Design a protein around this nucleic acid. Structure first.
Ligand code: FDA
Length: 459
DNA sequence: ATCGGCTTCGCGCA
DNA sequence: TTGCGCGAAGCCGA
């Protein structure tokens, strides 16, 4: 039995007599899954089978092959891991509000379970689902270490107000995962799906002049197994010097975990457990935990309590006041979406970062902050900057379309979870970042040098 | 309370 | 490079 405040009753009803169906969505993995572990639990009590259903919405069209290969290949692996433990996996195509409801009837599901996501479109779908089912319907936070609706009931103004809260709750929720018990009872194509999708997304590929792709797909092998190794090599090779090199992009000293945590291919709670027991720097473990605990989960807190998380209106009062005061200011440059996208600005280090984004699908965490603040400076308005920053983040980051994306863009452009700094023209009081500031931190000429000879080779 | 502390910004200066 | 003190800055929360 697991901690019962990880569950929240979406719909009450009378328990069916069919199997218990887990509607996977955020947490695409079989280990370390409070949503899967809970569903198994209530099917063993009901003495019924547990099964997984996954829905494949048209959303893969609003991004690239890169994200879809990465996630489809992952699911190809999960489906096998699940049938190992005797748990069937069903793959729906279409709109959840309709297809999940149909499945719930067509298999005679006795209880519905899902994982937790704060993006508006899950609440939309869930709310259709509730309407068309009669069975009970459960939702489990399987993504955060502390259930979002439990760490805080309000928008948290800053990391230092969240932090005493989150940490006062870890002795309760930071625990080991039990074993996923195979099915005892035995209930009664993703190859085409992955081909069909790439023939669709192929006319939109990001190509170089010579028509081979920009994207390089060997930096991150998708899937649960590949993720475990990225966690272990992190703990053994990179964790010890994270604190002191987090900010250098010429070093590859990050965890590189974010494509995995986004597709739920690995549990942040598992990471935390392995980091905690590891014996590296106390400084570095502090650095690291605060990014995967405080910053990650306050990003869910943000989107969960501010339905306008991808818009201007969600900036803090002072932020908007300041930015409106400077809408009339003359911008040093202005660039269009296309120009940013193609890395055609005056700033070679900015374009360098953009080139890291296009070719690899994961931009360095420090360069990300620089990236968005310089979009605000050379956009024609704050709204356009947001719109540009979201469109390029979500289109090219393997970890895009994610609460961290919005809560990081908002931190960057609109000062959300941050404070006021010295007033500038165009960018108001938003924390400024400078090219020369980057030079006191790392060897910009190497970072630039790495992605040079790719703007020329692309168009 | 009223007032200390804040993702770790940039920049001078040693 | 690297570290320190400083400056400009709105406000939570204890
Ligand atoms: C403009 C902009 C845009 C984005 C983001 C930040 C900024 C300023 N982020 C957040 C952060 O840049 C990103 O999570 C890390 O670079 C992920 O790479 P690593 O896992 O290697 O980092 P690293 O190992 O240093 O970080 C560990 C984990 O902490 C979390 N994290 C780190 N910094 C964070 C931040 N500022 N906000 C929220 N979570 C943070 C992530 O969960 C990350 O996996 C984001 N993240 C993401 O997952 N998807 C995205 O699309 C974006 N987009």
């Amino acid at each position: 039995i697991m901690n019962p405040k990880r569950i929240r009753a979406l719909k009450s009803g009378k328990q069916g007599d069919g199997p218990v169906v887990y509607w996977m969505s955020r947490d695409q993995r079989a280990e370390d899954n409070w949503a899967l572990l809970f569903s198994r639990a209530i099917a063993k009590e009901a003495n019924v089978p547990v099964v997984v259903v996954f829905c494949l919405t048209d959303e893969f069209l609003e991004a690239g092959i890169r994200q879809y290969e990465f996630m489809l290949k992952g699911l190809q692996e999960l489906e096998v891991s699940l049938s190992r433990k005797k748990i069937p996996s069903f793959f729906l195509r279409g709109d959840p509000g309709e297809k999940i409801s149909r499945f719930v009837k067509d298999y005679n599901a006795g209880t519905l379970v899902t994982d937790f996501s704060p993006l508006r479109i899950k609440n939309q779908w869930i709310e259709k689902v509730i309407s068309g089912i009669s069975i009970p319907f459960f939702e489990v936070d399987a993504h955060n270490v502390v259930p979002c609706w439990e760490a805080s009931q309000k928008h948290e103004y800053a990391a230092h107000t969240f932090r005493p809260k989150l940490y006062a709750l870890l002795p309760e929720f930071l625990e080991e995962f039990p074993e996923l018990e195979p099915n005892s009872v035995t209930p009664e194509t993703l190859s085409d799906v992955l081909e069909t999708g790439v023939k669709a997304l192929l006319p939109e590929r990001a190509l170089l002049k010579n028509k081979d792709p920009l994207f390089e797909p060997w930096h991150f092998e998708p899937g649960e197994k590949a993720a475990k190794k990225v966690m272990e090599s992190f703990i053994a090779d990179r964790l010890d010097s994270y604190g002191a090199l987090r900010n250098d992009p010429t070093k590859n000293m990050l965890s590189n975990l974010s494509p995995y945590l986004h597709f739920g291919q690995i549990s942040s709670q598992r990471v935390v457990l392995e980091v905690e027991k590891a014996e590296s720097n106390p400084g570095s473990k502090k650095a690291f935990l605060d990014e995967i605990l405080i910053w990650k989960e306050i990003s869910d807190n943000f989107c969960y309590y501010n339905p306008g998380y991808d818009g201007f209106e969600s900036f803090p009062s002072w932020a908007k006041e300041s930015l409106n005061a400077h809408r009339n200011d003359v911008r040093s440059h202005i660039y269009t979406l296309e120009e940013f996208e193609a890395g055609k600005t005056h700033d070679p280090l900015w374009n360098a970062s953009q080139m890291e984004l296009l070719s690899t699908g994961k931009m360095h965490g420090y360069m990300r902050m620089y990236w968005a603040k310089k979009i605000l400076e050379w956009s024609e308005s704050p709204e356009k900057a947001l719109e540009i920053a979201i469109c390029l983040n979500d289109r090219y980051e393997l970890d895009g379309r994610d609460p961290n994306g919005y809560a990081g863009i908002a931190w960057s452009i609109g000062g959300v979870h941050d404070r006021a700094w010295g007033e500038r023209e165009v960018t108001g009081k938003i924390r400024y970042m400078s090219y020369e500031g980057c030079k006191r931190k790392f060897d910009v000429k190497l970072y630039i040098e790495k992605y040079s000879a790719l703007d020329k080779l692309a168009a």
